[model samples]
Target: EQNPSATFDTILTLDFGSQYTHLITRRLREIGVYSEMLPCTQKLADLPFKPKGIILSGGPYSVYEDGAPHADPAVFELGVPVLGICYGLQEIAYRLGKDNVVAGTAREYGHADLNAQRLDNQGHVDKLFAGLEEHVKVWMSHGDKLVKLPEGFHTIATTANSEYAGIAHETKPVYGIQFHPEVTHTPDGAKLLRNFAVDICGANPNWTMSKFVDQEILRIRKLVGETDHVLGAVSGGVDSTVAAKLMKEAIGDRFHAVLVNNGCMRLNECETVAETLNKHLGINLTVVDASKRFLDGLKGVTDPEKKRMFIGATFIDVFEEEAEKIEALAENSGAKVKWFLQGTLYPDVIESISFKGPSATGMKLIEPLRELFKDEVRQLGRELGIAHELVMRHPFPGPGIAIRVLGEVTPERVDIARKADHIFISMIREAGLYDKISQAYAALDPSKAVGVMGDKRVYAEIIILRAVETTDFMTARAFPFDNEFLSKCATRIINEVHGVSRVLYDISSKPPATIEME
Candidate 1:
């Protein structure tokens, strides 16, 4: 099982294909309670352990739609506390009565004020809203709303647009909310979740990064036997670095770390990673500079998906060849390299394109951070004593700047993308906004426009700058940069960087447009 802390007080989140589904689990974990996510179609009987509580994630589908996904009916009969958000609330209403939920003429999206209803003469609210203020701001993104409550269900809260915004079962521990508490826009979302998971559900909030490190170290040692060695790919990202440190703690020199340079990484990324892993952390490391082959393969690839495929294929080729050589060297030392380590996290596995389990190379997989979110990995990295800067660096994609660049990949194109990115990052740090933003990068706009340089018409590529503020990365908003800061970045890029004519700032959010363009 990916969940190493399943034995602890655990909450189960059922995924309904909502973009914010993963964030539910992330929030629960942040509350120091162990939580896991399974598909909405997952049968409760198949669960390895009974949950302290259950959460139904918000999705894009309507409960009344034909063939729409639904949680196992057995969820309500489990006798455990259940909290549904958005579509989840509609699901509860639909199960109780066919006409309980109906389409709203005015779809509720964005922010709304939630007024917790006083349930009794003592001004007591529902347990879920116990600690929250009478009026709280919540994020609403649902089209359908509950028209009425079923038998034994009572309204707990109401919004200006939604009369039945929050509902609770008077006799049982069942609750539902039409707004999203998992998003950051709802400032008190975490407090509300804490109330449900800790107060109502009786979950123990003792899951800490220190405890996780201790358990994972023991788990790693037991998984890889004495005679077998493990090989890991290090991308200098916190995910891989923390996993590498954990392996080293468990099996000393038996763990081998390799870094592959795809030629599109940030400036001096390979050298920086190699120095940290070897000179600082004391892990057996190797650097494979396969930039030429990777660049050559991506020459004509304009499609984002195709660029990913070419980079992925080339990465595997380089790793496989290096693995063979490592195995031969291990054989001379009387040790067998039997397991492969991956830095795959919870979001990576739950987001589909499932790449978990044994590798195609016939080697068993050992993913230490398999059940962790990116923030949790950063915590674990700090617990493992990784460099402060390395632990806090913004997330970088595995395909590097290949995805950031829009058009064909060439040395010149890659260089332009890298240089623009370097300037953006430097300016963010100079403005003390590096740690404030979740992720930021620069991309090369494939199309070129006319520019007057020294009274001559010069046509060159445009640079697009993107930055987002997010916690789990499941949902993100464009970083709100003041005009001065934005103009500073654009001015520097146009003046300092050699790429092109103009610079544009992306103002798109995660719903209609994703953080990454294609």
Candidate 2:
């Protein structure tokens, strides 16, 4: 995926220890600018690539604190356009030698109107705040007020309490708003983001998922060339399937897909995946049965991260062996071999980079549909003519039912989890709640409790159902399932699954709880 467009127009968001730092990134990404979060302390020399613009995020700390979050002074001197919000505004004013930015009398925590006297005079209203009248509703959450303007900065907008509600440096390409433009509480938040990102920074809005796919296909084809065979590992999931289809489209007959049944999947999952992909995508696919190999690899390991790494490494080994077999066949048929395609998503990339830091940048990966969220992926799949059932299936982890089963990896546990999951999904669909959520899954947790069945003591596993509403995986809120739907799902899981069980619905958001229990 080495190409001009693949080098996304980067927006470097400096996290000032803000709770909404991630939310700001999500907002920028929604507008199609690929954004990544960096610690506020990031050095100017090591900023990997040039950012089109910089956004200073709001934080809970006051600017006068001894060691509150602070950016490198050179960041402001980089000459790139900068936008500061709330706490960020305070920091910028203080850093630029403005006086009297002490704590205010009252904390402004709700909606407020900004008097755009200067903005209105300068035609900023028509250019930046189009469709809105002179006064605009804005969400403010700050305790510090900019009492005095910096040397050459002028107030463009203000609220009742603060005279310098919004300021722009007369010469520097810098702007600061005392109110938060990232929060939904601001009615014109999206428009403000667009105004800064597009109107001011001169960024192109050609960052759509379709454009990403087109660019990646051309890049993949150029990298792998014609007549060079590539191997793709398909786990019967949408991510892998989409990658395989894109690779096949790029290289035609040179792309090979390996469907590995590692004995950790749900009942008949491998068969269903293989049939659906082969019949629909028309790609060269080989089904590899490596259940024993995977079981041996997972002999006595129970740590979740270790399990994921082992499974990932083993799948790669199996796929490589299959690729060797394909190469032998290609030799007989006269062809060459190279390259591998992965169905990695944007969330996966963010998690990997954040957890491991920037040290792992050399990894070569091709992701044709990396920019799309799960819902967008389904829509693209539909446009690509994939079956409705396949397109609408709930998201499944790469570890499959193994992660869902808390304690151990066993075929019986996999089946139990799969059946329970299937029942939950079916019931949600019947209740017409499937389309209401972004993702939903059910898993069996091994640690259980004693239950009375026919006046006898019995141990039972707990089945947990997770449903979330998310625009992007960066932030999510758990779906609110009423008592009626919960009761029905709980009853069915306990009654249908052979394992004695209790059912519980997870009611935690993304910050405190991930979608998966394990």
Candidate 3:
């Protein structure tokens, strides 16, 4: 059992084997509820902390199937309010002697318009559907439908296919929906979750980024005690920037940020990153120029993952050298430095632990923003009074522009790629679409392309533009940029950047292609 703190006191979502259960947790956290996911089989005796409310996740199993996923009946009797979705609704209906549900009908695989028959003035404008006007658009993918309502349950909403679109007990604080409130296909999905978790359940929306920073600062102080020196690896991305800034704030002038320019970055990236961290954040910064070393190490590398592994290993070597230099300086000045700060997030930590062995218990890692996603870190930067320009910057990978150039990373290719990328971003911003997107980046694929440059037939590299709208990087949707805006961007990149002839915008999401091309 994990012991949660006051920072995440409001809501808890119980997983019932749904594919989108994790997405539901992320959606609630995005709305400032600080929710988490627990396995449906978690015993009540294992619960060390109490949550304000509970939610049952939609699953892929049918309630009437043999060995269908089932939870202990004690979970429903926990006194706290509960809301169910899809299969969750079916489970509740079956347990309450309301309806006999089975996998009979073909799954309704897409969006549907729902009609609510507001009983006793419980109209669509009620708390459950707050922030929505008129009929609601919801995503439905269930095979089982409630053919009959339970003894005390009342039908609130219906659709052409689902008779019991929405049901709830008249007296008890229980409700269920056949459609998914965790997906964006449901127009007002987030609003519905917010209403149920915050308004109906009376859960507080106290999970702000500033509160997270304060809690992390306290934890860092207790761990470091009176340590006078700490070293942080700054990768010129938002994650490293936020970590460096928070550590500097916690320890004042004692934190030193080391940046390693690995020669595989965007054009003039070293200067841009150094200036941003030192001038903008007012932190003690140091630049370790290891570009030549990296260039020598990757003299003929072409494979993507191989390049990434080489870069990662080279980064550790460079960072370790810098740490030694800093320690030597501290020792000469009668001080000791032993702590290392990583900008690693919870997902990265989880992946590492899952793939490798357990993390050494005695090893010290100061990750001020470990629990936060990329957007959440930016929000904390704003709450800490960072400038809006810095806060609104798009996310760049830890390996920098090397991943953007999908082939051999040469200096000439890096410069041309940077110019093309800069033009693409500038066009989007000029059209007032920068903040509307979650992330936008351009990549240079060194594949064959037909082009006529300088009145001569030649093969040039192709440029691919990727823009996505995502709450978290776990899953994302390709941004729907208008045809006019896209054409303008392509024209500008081709004519002004002096790169290649072809410009392609990636329509693929995380399922087939990751945000980064490499």
Against the true structure, whose lDDT is highest? 1
User: Model 3: which residue pairs collide?
Assistant: none
Q: Which wins on TM-score, candidate 1 or candidate 2?
A: 1
- For residues 422-483, could you state the per-residue lDDT of candidate 3 as single tens digits? 88888889888888888887888778788887789888778889999876556788999999
Range of the 10 consecutive residues with the lowest summed lDDT in candidate 3: 354-363
TM-score of 2: 0.84
Per-residue error at 323 for model 3, in Å? Answer: 2.5
Candidate 2 lDDT by residue in tens digits, 65-91: 566667778768887778887777877
- Clashes per model (N, Cα, C within 3 A): 0, 0, 0
* lDDT against true structure, model 2: 0.72
Residue pairs with colliding backbones in model 1 are none
Candidate 1 lDDT over residue span 381-468, tens digit each: 8998987888998877788888888868788878988999999999899989999998899998868888878899988898999999
TM-score of each candidate? 0.87, 0.84, 0.84
All predictions: root-mean-square deviation over Cα? 4.3, 4.1, 4.6
Q: On lDDT, who's better, 1 or 3?
A: 1
